[PDB]
């Protein structure tokens, strides 16, 4: 466990956090060619307090948000969200029927799948379980864009390899890559 009520509140109320999360969500939406210029249904993965999910609502999207933290969800409740919030661990799978969502988005969250604290399956197993179920719950030709924070290049390669084995194709977009203070990795994928 990582967040509490105090820390979830301080994160969601910080103006600097709001601005950066909003910029990365809007960049993820620009990279999401499937919702870009289209209406869509969306899954927001690691939705937190709904800072990314509010910006999906701004473009007229209907969305479901998944997060593992109660306190992040409880803080989301008071923010007048239009999305459905669900308490859920993404590493156990995506619990929707095949072909439910046009797209999926995740901002600042999937690097937690490399962490082995919460559960006693390998991160490698949970990573496979995430990508294989994520491929299934997406429509055919659906898209997934994930902004994420990798600790090293091995973590990037492992994430890419698991997405590749699950049936995704696409690549990695690295914005501002000459500043390792401000650079951001976006995983940009599509299903078959």
């Amino acid at each position: 466990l990582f967040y509490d009520e105090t820390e979830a509140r301080k994160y969601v109320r910080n103006s600097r956090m709001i601005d950066i999360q909003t910029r990365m969500a809007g960049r993820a939406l620009e990279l999401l060619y499937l919702p870009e210029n289209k209406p869509c249904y969306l899954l927001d993965i690691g939705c937190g307090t709904g800072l990314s999910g509010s910006y999906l609502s701004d473009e007229g999207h209907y969305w479901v948000g998944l997060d593992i933290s109660p306190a992040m969800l409880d803080e989301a409740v008071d923010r007048e969200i239009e999305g459905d919030l669900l308490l859920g661990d993404m590493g156990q799978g995506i619990p929707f029927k095949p072909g439910t969502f046009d797209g999926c988005i995740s901002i600042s969250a999937v690097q937690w799948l490399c962490n082995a604290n919460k559960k006693s399956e390998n991160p490698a197993k949970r990573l496979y379980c995430f990508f294989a179920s994520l491929f299934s719950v997406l429509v055919r030709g659906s898209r997934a864009v994930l902004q994420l924070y990798p600790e090293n290049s091995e973590q990037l390669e492992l994430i890419t390899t698991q997405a590749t084995k699950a049936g995704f194709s696409g690549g990695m977009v690295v914005d501002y890559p000459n500043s390792a203070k401000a650079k951001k990795f976006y995983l940009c994928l599509f299903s078959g």
């Binding site: 007229g60 969800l73 669900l86 308490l87 661990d89 156990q92 799978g93 619990p95 029927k97 046009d102």
Partner: protein, 118 residues
């Protein structure tokens, strides 16, 4: 928890999966929350909805006011589309239960989040 979300949600048990949909629904509490009316979105939801599972979840929640199969059109019949908006988008479960009839497990929805953990 909008009613529509019922159609995109299933039991997380590895053995029930991929047969674990739909969950059977009971609501201890409900609310109507105002939402903007979009006929085009409702009509573009129809091709992503499992209609058989839609009727069953409505029946479980005490509603037979639903067409027998999926519908079609130019969106000019506001009657059926406004009734679909009212049901799918505007009725929210606050408190309730989600029972899978294959593993026997009952998951809760509480203010107003469905939880799919063991």
């Amino acid at each position: 928890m909008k009613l529509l979300t019922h159609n995109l949600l299933s039991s997380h048990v590895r053995g029930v999966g991929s047969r674990g949909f739909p969950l059977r629904l009971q609501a201890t509490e409900v609310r109507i929350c105002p939402v903007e009316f979009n006929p085009n979105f409702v009509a573009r939801m129809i091709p992503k909805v499992e209609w058989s599972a839609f009727l069953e979840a409505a029946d479980n929640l005490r509603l037979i006011q639903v067409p027998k199969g999926p519908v079609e059109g130019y969106e000019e019949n506001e009657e059926f589309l406004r009734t679909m908006h009212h049901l799918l988008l505007e009725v929210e479960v606050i408190e309730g239960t989600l029972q899978c009839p294959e593993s026997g497990r009952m998951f809760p929805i509480s203010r107003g989040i469905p939880n799919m953990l063991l």
